[model samples]
Target chain A: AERTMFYGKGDVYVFRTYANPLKGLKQIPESNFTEKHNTIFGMNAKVALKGEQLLTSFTEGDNSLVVATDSMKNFIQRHAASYEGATLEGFLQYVCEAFLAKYSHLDAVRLEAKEYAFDDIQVGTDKGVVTSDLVFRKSRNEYVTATVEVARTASGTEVVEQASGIADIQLIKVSGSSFYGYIIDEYTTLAEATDRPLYIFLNIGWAYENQDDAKGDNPANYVAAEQVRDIAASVFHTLDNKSIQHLIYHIGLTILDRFPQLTEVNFGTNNRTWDTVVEGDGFKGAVFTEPRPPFGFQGFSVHQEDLAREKASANSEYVAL
Target chain B: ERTMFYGKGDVYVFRTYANPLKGLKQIPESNFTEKHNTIFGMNAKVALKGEQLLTSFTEGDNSLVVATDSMKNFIQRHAASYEGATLEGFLQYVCEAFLAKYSHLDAVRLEAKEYAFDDIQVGTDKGVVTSDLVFRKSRNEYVTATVEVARTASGTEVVEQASGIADIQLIKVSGSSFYGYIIDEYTTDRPLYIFLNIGWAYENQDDAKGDNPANYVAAEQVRDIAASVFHTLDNKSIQHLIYHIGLTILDRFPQLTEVNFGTNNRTWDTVVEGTDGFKGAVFTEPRPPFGFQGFSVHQEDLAREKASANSEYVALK
Candidate 1:
């Protein structure tokens, strides 16, 4: 029979009081110097409980041993009120540790936090037009996520696995991108363009070499999610690439080079390139709209060892796109 | 006999050339201005009458079937050609156009989701003003519409249409209570988080137009009115709260025949109780199997028979 099973609360929103060190990326338009004083650090925490004890609740009408999902949600919020961390990873660690410490019956616990972005709104203050300290506008379609799983050991709960990432990084660059040098066939209706507007939605996730490295007081040990987002945006802005694959691969390489604690990074992207309707003289003067799916999707996984070997071989400059 | 159905979905289109309307009431402490010049994105789904296309499903015939890809292309093409301000207008245009173009299909139903984008604040020569091209995404809320068009004896006509505001997530810190319900073994409540979706229909499409449009309810008005009511009203239950919202919409827009609301009761569970009896409690959202309340308020006009017949005609579709 099937053995492993788990259930817990999902979408437990915690509106945290946090001031993110990485305010906003300079690569994005109108995003630089966007102060996050009134940071609406909204997060959806999904905590899963796994143990042999949970099997009884599934097989029979036994909810005696079951830790109520509602209780789990409450625990998260109660802990959130006291959590003073600035990072999602740190919050996940605190929750997982506290959950395992309290519930002795459970064999393992897994917690995941997905941050909803809220940017500070510009309000008409007495001191000229300044960013509001209390009001914020929601930034849709993107999130920073982190996950931590702990298992009960002989001494106490130990961090078994951890990962950090960002999702729905929707970006559109008007120029300095292209799609060419691909195979042409009878069914090929796509035209090769040397320069065009490139719009993509990407999800980048990374794991740590050591799980403990993900958690610590030292900020350098943890991979900053904003830093990853900044790297992706900056590379996309700077790179004049042949394809999405080449563009995202270089983004992964740059991220790995910056953070040595990461074991591997994985990227999933959807090429939602806009179909230019009325071409104009300049790049910014064109009319564009996105075409319907099915969209072209690309996925890549880069490893630290692979990068290390490539660098040791004196072929650091060469990138296999 | 079983019903057979098929359609295309996830046909997302983001048009940067759209010029939305102005004159929305801006709430205090917000940077929202009346200027809106762009539609960030919209998603569409089309459902065609399946009786004619059954041969392709059962007998491996390909002549009667319209490729879903073609449907996507048609939607994208018409979406670009559509010159309208509201989601309802765009949906009505697409549905009617689809039915008019494809004669084999007897009816076409189209649904659209218009993503919300608020213009970001920028410093201009005339002080702070909303940007024309740049925008910031509005989360958890968007405008939605569904239109169904059928081929009548003379020509294609819109049989049914609805405009809505969806996924308006709101949380109230206080001035809300839940009590006096049937107390079973499982019953509890404290704080509330609302996931609100509201849809309204017009008595006549013509009422939505003219020199002074009376029936044309602005999507922003619906959103703002609902939000304003939610913030101010002190109610006993979600039912009472949404009833007020629906009533206000019907009162504000006389052109609307009826307004309905679908709200999820996402009240938080009290985890830690305060010692000072000040109701300072830490709470979290309740788990699945949440309480839901669906409410509707309609205008009771003296000329009801004509309105009833018109609604019945659309319902038959």
Candidate 2:
């Protein structure tokens, strides 16, 4: 009875190997104690693999090649204990190598990790937070992600292609952003604002140029996660963005241009803003504008499609984070 | 022009996951209420199948693809009447519906994460007022689920499923105790509270069951069952108690094939007094199983087996 074949793994557990990751906070120094720190993170990793040779197993239910995801999760925790807070890229490279070296069957594996967020807990004062050692509480509905694809190159060389970045990086600016000039359709019941509060929930990712055997204990000299966060936050505040599209573009361009290790930076901008509308003169029936507005957002990626083009026309070297 | 292809879409949905009253706060303070909050996130994917899609990939053909904007609309429209259902349930429904609507190729995978919120209270002249609203400062403690679905071997309907819940945190007030044994300087001590974080998995028992199946083990139910046990049980020994807890869970739910939970024991020295009832010198002692690199007393129960034998909740007197 030939039906179909399916296999994948779940419960890949990962987290900071620390009692209090918020204690000796690096990146953002401990001096400015009031500022919120991203000290804690936990990710439940999941993986799925595909190979032409496994097709027979898929239709026949031969689980010989099945690397139980429970084993995958166990592997994550076992390896997490050995990790020494190295760069995310270096970490991924090390893990990816372990998989390829350990198992010889599969050709490609997709490893996705979601980094959860946290903030310092507030104390007695209305706006004051505890800063002595650090007591944290769950803060928002935001997360950052890093996805890596490790596979065997045509000649059987192990390589990794990664999309590394943060997401749901929500922020609100009282001014310095606006949206205007759109085609008025039948359902266009709105007015344009010159300047208003702009709220953005940004998702960002950067792809590496070439596959590399990222195997080692030393940290990779590429872009660091904290550096990207600072850059995204820094640019969004400094630049006078006209639309979510404009802000996301600048953020992506700056990261790609600054760090040549990354070939392309793809991002999605989710807008969360309410409007204060007014439509009354000698009004027909005592009118006022709606407090809420329709949902809107944008997405864009800044990457040199052709690597040869970058090598020929542009500077090959760039800054390291 | 030939490189990796990627597109992103956003969907703001409400009421898909179960947020029950067991962990955070309950009772006269608040009842056992089911909560629904805003879970907004962007979903990004790549082209996986079909001849035309691959042709578009290799030859720059655009006729056979669905636009990202359309996908966004699809997500929102699908969520129009979707409320009060759990995250896994909604995801399973939506994924199956999508496959049925397209009737395309082999399979597709979907992942969605739910956002978390907490109440902020302030003291004012009117009284103690709590704002049921506040934007989280840091993003932690969000529930995320990933499900993979594929059409059956028969090729008529879809079957095959695996779903998981991540970032479930539970804390039991005065929930743990250590006794009967000692390691070097470690003495038999009193019951200490614990902060536990757990992750669980529920899969179709058979190979033929569909991925993202509607009747798979509910992660929320697992959390509730575990919390319900932890909330009342008087723990004697940490490890042994954890073993019992796992056994009890397996006894109750046959749907869950595996469960994993961890707890860090943070303890301080106790003053076992009466040096003639004067409590002389107010002696101080330090408890030291604390690992600064990780937890003070970090312990985890990972991938525990579900018992098919004893499938009933048994309480010891």
Candidate 3:
């Protein structure tokens, strides 16, 4: 018999009225647009409940203490309209507080929200090209996500942990990347490349030093997801990365440096380099297709305190496994 | 123990390439784009069948079975050579090629899902024009097709086929309601939101080919019809809503034998009530145990007996 269990409702979508504009990011020279004004903030909200009283429903088919998932869905939807926050973290915090306030039996409530990316439609006017407020276009695959957990405290409900991140940021740089300097054996079939196109689908997540730094109305405290994405893209585009490991390490370092409130940052990276079918003459153009599976993956993490300690300890011993 | 059985469930292939194309159905007055160099994406899955391959599972004999890894490579190789327009044509070509290459295999079924991309508008020397190289993903709905090919005495031939539009998420804030149901304790309705997956079939494969195909049904036409019906109609219930969609599709396309709909009742439940009454109520999606309904509307005069005979192999498999 398992000891711990949870029950909740998921896929509750809420279309917010307005959202914060993405600002302070260096734009790509190749990109067509200059500014993004309008945003259709559609979000998928999920909540999980943990309580000892709810275990009877699973063990003995008892229904006395269970709060129906249907009701939970209703509660989330109803409270979402009342929420007047712009950021996903603030919205999640508001929903968690409301759930704990309404249902006292639950020991803890964990809420997650993912923002759907809707690019504003660009319209040409006599004055200039302007972003359309009424019209929008949906961009699939990549989105910003946040998770918040609240528990019953000594006095009242309070946030326990909060984290924010981005998912499925697929990008491909045509050049300025290489793969070499690794263990070679009979099983190694990969040819060494000095310069080649780097393609990666990256997921980055980070935690703040204080939970309050993630939520609330203060824009300075909030770590904008757009900024994280911009930093990653800028680093990937400019850096002469030796490997995926080297690339993500610099990205993590830059993120931690850019946001002083961040405690740690982690990355999930997939090296989905396309198989060059027909190579053109010297960085001109090339025909490419997706490679067969069993692809390469690399994971890395960096922390603020660990970096500080490493800098202080000049003669620290190192071990590699 | 069972005497007869089948195997080889499915293998999936996902590929994306830069494709050149013209615009989809648009009115004459609409801003016509000259060319579209959009990113075309495809997800293909193949199912196989043969009695000889079954021995790998029963007696640990793996000689007859084909490696899924090889199959992936084969599909990608053939997909690079595909020059067709529609997803259905692409699927037919792939399935036929699969059965032709692997003569030991008795049958093959291939399904393809097309990822949609919309061209982005950019400023040019001549005012604003749609960029040929740049595109944004169209997130709402996509087209899918399935083709089943079998080894006949004289090579392989298509036996069953279907085309569909899937993952169409739509919501209407007002002018929709549900009432007078088995309202004992749990029953309600308000604004309607539904996720629809609709499919249609032709009389035969010949009707889907040739210079001017007789029974050709454009995928965008079906999508537009469904969207228009949902937008204009004052939906009473999900049942009433989808029936009209199916009926309207059949009415629009005479060559189609039948049209079917798979829809989920995604109505939002009201949470907060206003001071005066239940005005400006915030809504959320209903939890699991959602209302699922399906309807197949077909022409009554069409040869029903022949339809049954042709569909028997599909059911038996």
Candidate 4:
């Protein structure tokens, strides 16, 4: 059976000793018994969050397998004090019992923290008291991506990637090449013309499981995340420049040329934005491998447009504002 | 005066000739012969471009600094003849004439072209024809930047660089370890947050008024301009990672970075989006460099918010 993992939980801290110590002394030692920050072992609760499996569903309303969203929220508040909130991954163990073991219909539990942003809002304007809204105003965030593909054959699940940092990638571009020409009518002009832009859009997703272990509580230097972000940027910039018109294997080959570590890429372009952002050159918007420009390639600026006999395209150039 | 350069204007092309074949391919072995694109030497039914030049005080009544809006319209009519149409630095030349030779004016003249899109009236009953009014369309657009400081001596300009080839320069991290944690109780809980975003805004302005004779035709390579559209993509990819950002810099000691490259850019964020493009972070309205994050060291996630705790910002890591 195909298992859909839906995880929802907030990263919160309960400090036994929050405001006492200052500066360098605040950092917890690698061999600490448990008490790290300003909190005395019981006062400060840090969820170096491992996983929280709230619900698993096959479809929208498959009553056979459903962990109500309410059950998930109640578990966070109850488990924080039960474990003194000091342990991180063990808290995930509590989640597994509440959702997976309790619900008989569920087969597997796959949970991951999408982000962790912490901020202090005055507790409902009552006093100088602060409460965690957990929505905005947080400083640090991490997206722990985990996948537990369940099947009857193996009877097991795996953490595809862990939640460490929240990284996002977005890209856009317009392409051009000047070689094709046709339509000698009055409406057509220019000795030669470029094809409709062949824009290549890209977005990358990566998950680093052992991210926090490397930071060791400083949370300042994100070695793994920076490495991924930089690599993603380089990969994307290359994808934008290559021509798909004649070179079908263009993008795939280049990705292999540089970063071989990558396994998959969600790369493509919806040429429909053709005339929206700009005018579309006359070319059918279709996908093909080793695709060549539709027209025969004589290759030279030989398609001279006879514009004197054709109606001009708004004077071709404008002098007015 | 605090300068904000968002300007516009029109460019002119001076018609000049090389040589006429005079319907004969052979001009004798004794002398070198020249061939015009057509049988004629030159023609002057030139074109104009509206370049946006908002760097200076607004010109009275002469919105002389409109923008490249009309340049698009002119393209439809300009495919007529290759008579005097030299491609080399004409695009650059037009920029120089529009900016370098300005009067009671603003900053320089900038040129931008998007070739892929051509908008038209979506549904117009023109017999059997359907039209989509092209609101905007671009192919491979590059800009020509100029910083002409005039004096009793002379004025000069060159194609500095072009931007927008790649928006790879923009970045936003949802959660930054840059700030949080306050020492005091009345207003505690905050460490100086760091929001760092780096972008290499590139641009190229044409250099005008060279006295070299052989350099004229090299000025317009219609074919080359076409080639650049695709070439730019590869260059942008390797520029920051593989190549140097200063590859275009001819001089070792240039005074400016992207901020002074005749660039007119604002952080593109929809305010209604509530600055949430960064997850926990919100996409605030685009502001100037100083107040971008409401702080000084912005790209570093340092907002203008003076921490009630620290009088000054903590230095960036």
Best-matching candidate per lDDT:
1
lDDT (Cα, tens digit) per residue for candidate 2, span A3-57: 3333456656566635222222223221222222325546656666656667766
Residues B79-166 of candidate 3 have per-residue lDDT tens digits of 6787644567767777788777878887777777776777679999999997866777788688788888888998778888889999
- Sort the candidates on lDDT, descending order: 1, 3, 2, 4
Q: Write the per-residue lDDT of candidate 4 for residues A95-206, one digit (tens) a residue.
A: 4444544554444443333324233345545565565443234434322222222211134433333333223333333444333544577766434435434433232232
Model 1 clash pairs?
none
TM-score of each: 0.49, 0.41, 0.50, 0.23
TM-score of the A chain in model 4: 0.34
RMSD of 2: 29.8
* lDDT of each residue in B94-157, candidate 2, tens digit only: 6566667766544545566555555567777888886544445325444555555566656533
Which candidate, 1 or 3, would have the higher lDDT against the true structure?
1
Task: Select the stronger candidate by lDDT from 1 and 4.
Answer: 1
- Over the stretch B222-298, how does candidate 1's per-residue lDDT look in tens digits? 87777777777776688887877776676566678899989987766676765544276676544445678787788
Candidate 4 clashes: the total is 94
- Residue B263, model 3, lDDT: 89
DockQ of the candidate models in sequence: 0.02, 0.01, 0.02, 0.01
Give the distance in Å from residue B170's predicted Cα in candidate 4 to where it truly belongs: 41
What is the descending TM-score order?
3, 1, 2, 4
Q: Give per-residue CA lDDT, model 3, range A1-321, as digits (tens).
A: 367789999998887665554333333332333333425657898889887778889989998888889988888878766776566787788888888888778888899888867876689989899977788888796788999999898898777878899999999999899999888997788899998789999999999888876654565667766668877888888788899988887778777766768889999999877788778768677787766544588888988865566446767331111
The deviation in Å at residue A142 for candidate 1 is 2.3
Name the regions of candidate 4 deviating beyond 4 angstroms.
A1-67, A76-98, A101-105, A110-168, A173-201, A206-229, A238-240, A243-321, B1-317
What's model 4's TM-score? 0.23
Error of 4 at B143 (Å): 50
